[PDB]
TrEMBL record:
Disulphide bond pairs: 104-144, 499-518, 541-560, 584-603
GN (gene name): agaA2
UniProt GO molecular function: alpha-galactosidase activity
Binding site for alpha-L-arabinopyanose 3: 543, 546, 561, 563, 565
Protein residues bound to beta-D-galactose 1: 54-55, 104, 140, 142, 182, 199, 203
Residues where beta-D-galactose 2 binds: 586, 589, 608
Pfam families: CBM13-like, Melibiase_2, Melibiase_C, Ricin_B_lectin
Cross-referenced InterPro entries: Aldolase_TIM, CBM13-like, GH, Glyco_hydro_27, Glyco_hydro_b, Melibiase_C, Ricin_B-like_lectins, Ricin_B_lectin
Hydrolase listed as a keyword: yes
Protein name from the UniProt record: Alpha-galactosidase
Taxonomic source organism: Streptomyces avermitilis (strain ATCC 31267 / DSM 46492 / JCM 5070 / NBRC 14893 / NCIMB 12804 / NRRL 8165 / MA-4680)
Gene3D superfamilies reported for this sequence: 2.80.10.50, Aldolase class I, Galactose-binding domain-like, Golgi alpha-mannosidase II
Protein keywords: Disulfide bond, Glycosidase, Hydrolase, Signal
Binding-site positions, alpha-L-arabinopyanose 4: 586, 589, 608
Length: 614
């Protein structure tokens, strides 16, 4: 039964932004026309709220007191005139700057001459105050100057976040911070708590190129960091290409489907003045929007890929027994794709399936659902009225500390944290699972009665898991339920007692595996497939670098590619052999410490070549 209410958490931003269609070629008239078309198309009623002015409004000029100055030939009345126009339509206004001394308009000019000085470094408080005073509700802070200068992203965006907070506090106007640093230095590790959204990869589309499904899928894959997203903090796979020239209606729907299953921001990027009726309908689908904006705030995850390129993604929705599902076909042929209740963390009990594009219920099942999916296409479903897998419930064993937390398998779990926050403001806490990288959790007002917020966490098989909270409201118990589709295994070295680990949750192709203290993080949870892959993050394969066949060959992660160097035999003697090479996974020089490199080596009887994988 439902006995403690789920507290709604903030959704990702919805709106439109000027970059994808206009590059730096923007002025007051360009923005005004898009606002008018946005309104005319009925986007506001569907939930689209932000009109975001991206790069090109500012050429780096400041007055003698350091105040940003604009060219009023392009921005008549100054920037407060465009915010006034946007606000006049009941919408929110966004602006754009850089973390460094000079912006992307300087480092990578794209439609205009280089703009030296187009960044906010040395002026964070000044500029944030200025944006808020002008009437901006949103600010996207880019990284061209940060990257150029060699800045540390985590500490730099903390400083920026603090300045954003002070500016909003001074004016009384909330300011939504978008961190835009392209997945450099792993923002999934640190951005939650600093900002409601952070870019997880490089740009979905570049100036002068045509929209690409390959690029779209790459951005989608790189945005999946389910432990980092929760309670109003979101991974950002970038601005929508929906409705841009070259994309068909089906590719537009697939674009919406994948952003929605992530719970990503829906920031339209097409030219709204020439948008078709069909495109507007795709942006406005309320059932797909409701999935994207789900009140529980969680990120969808891959739950099945029994056949290469035929994938099922599941998202845990608000309430109990409710899921959204995307069936995605990355192959060149139409194929059936099945999602099983077991993989979704439901029991084998009746549930209703609905197709969100057909807007019709399409059947019931106590076990699963199969649909035909076109080559390169997708189907968007909900599965509702299901029965949840049995959860564990825990009471804290000391202040803010939950111990003995149990998982049948290593992998992803949904945790509901009970608490009371009988004030008018959200409070935050730091959450750390085992020895993993910590995260920040937000706790919205509850009234006098307790409520829950939810987080996804990665746990180790067994009953040795700990969840520790620091700061924030006293919690009143946790509930833990597994998502079996995400099941993996720690790969633990016999000699070292340490786990095969990818440093600091890095996803970059070619990153070498290492030994590290076992903590059950996503960067330690390996899924062994029927294709003999050892898969990390749902989408990276343990890989003998460049198909190396001799001693000392580096073992890395790489996009899964079906090659023999990504295939592994898990042998009865405790060895793990690379299929291509016949060599053993090996902790280099039989070292046992954190940071010991994993390599391939000729198989022997040494315990630095012995592993447990359950
Ligand atoms: O020049 C502006 C562009 O700069 C890139 O760094 C950013 O990722 C894009 O989304 C756009 O803002």
């Amino acid at each position: 039964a439902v006995t403690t209410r789920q507290i709604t958490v903030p959704s990702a931003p919805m709106g439109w932004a000027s970059w994808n269609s206009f590059a730096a070629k923007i002025d007051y008239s360009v923005i005004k026309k898009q606002v008018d078309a946005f309104v005319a198309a009925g986007l506001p009623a569907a939930g689209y709220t932000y009109i975001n002015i991206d790069e090109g409004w500012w050429q780096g000029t400041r007055d003698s007191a350091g105040n940003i100055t604009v060219d009023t030939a392009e921005w008549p009345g100054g920037m407060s005139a465009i915010t006034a126009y946007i606000h006049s339509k009941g919408l929110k206004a966004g602006i754009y700057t850089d973390a460094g001394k000079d912006g992307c308009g300087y480092y990578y000019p794209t439609g205009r001459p280089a703009a030296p000085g187009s960044g906010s470094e040395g002026h964070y408080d000044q500029d944030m105050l200025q944006f808020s005073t002008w009437g901006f509700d949103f600010v996207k802070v880019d990284w061209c100057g940060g990257d150029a200068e060699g800045l540390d992203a985590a500490t730099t965006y903390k400083s920026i976040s603090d300045a954003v907070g002070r500016a909003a506090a001074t004016t009384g106007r909330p300011l939504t911070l978008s961190i835009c640093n392209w997945g450099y230095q792993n923002p999934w590790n640190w951005a939650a708590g600093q900002a409601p959204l952070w870019r997880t990869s490089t740009d979905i589309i570049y100036y002068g190129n045509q929209p690409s499904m390959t690029s779209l899928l790459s951005n989608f894959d790189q945005t999946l960091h389910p432990t980092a997203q929760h309670t109003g903090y979101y991974n950002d796979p970038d601005m929508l290409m929906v409705g841009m020239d070259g994309f068909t209606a089906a590719q537009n729907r697939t674009h919406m489907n994948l952003w929605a299953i992530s719970g990503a921001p829906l920031l339209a990027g097409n030219d709204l003045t020439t948008m078709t009726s069909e495109t507007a309908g795709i942006l406005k689908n309320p059932e797909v929007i409701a999935v994207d904006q789900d009140s529980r705030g969680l990120q969808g995850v891959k739950v099945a890929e029994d056949t290469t390129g035929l994938q099922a993604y599941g998202k845990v929705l608000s309430g109990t027994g409710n899921r959204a599902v995307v069936l995605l076909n990355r192959t060149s042929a139409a194929h059936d794709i099945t999602v099983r209740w077991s993989d979704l963390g439901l029991t084998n009990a009746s549930a209703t399936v609905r197709d969100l594009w057909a807007r019709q219920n399409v059947g019931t099942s106590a076990t699963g659902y199969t649909a035909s999916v076109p080559a390169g296409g997708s189907v968007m479903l909900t599965v509702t009225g299901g029965t949840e897998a049995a959860g564990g419930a825990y009471a804290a064993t000391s202040t803010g500390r939950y111990t003995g937390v149990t998982a049948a398998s290593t992998g992803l779990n949904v945790v509901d944290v009970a608490y009371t926050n009988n004030t008018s403001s959200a409070r935050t806490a730091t959450l750390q699972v085992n020895g993993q990288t910590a995260t920040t959790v937000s706790f919205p007002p509850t009234g006098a009665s307790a409520g829950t917020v939810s987080v996804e966490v990665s746990l180790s098989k067994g009953s040795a898991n700990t969840l520790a909270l620091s700061g924030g409201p006293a919690t009143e118990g946790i509930t833990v339920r597994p998502l079996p589709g995400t099941n993996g295994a720690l790969v633990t070295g016999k000699q070292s007692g340490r786990c095969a680990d990818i440093y600091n949750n890095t996803i970059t192709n070619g990153t070498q595996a290492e030994l590290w203290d076992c903590n059950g993080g996503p960067n330690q949870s390996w899924t062994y497939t029927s294709r003999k892959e050892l898969v990390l993050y749902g989408n990276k394969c343990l890989d003998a670098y460049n198909l190396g066949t001799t001693n000392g060959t580096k073992v890395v992660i790489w996009d899964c590619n079906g090659q023999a160097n990504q295939k592994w035999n898990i042998n009865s003697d405790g060895t793990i052999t690379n299929v291509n090479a016949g060599l053993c996974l090996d902790a280099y020089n039989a070292a046992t410490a954190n940071g010991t490199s994993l390599v391939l080596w000729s198989c022997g009887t040494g315990d630095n070549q012995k592993w447990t994988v359950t």
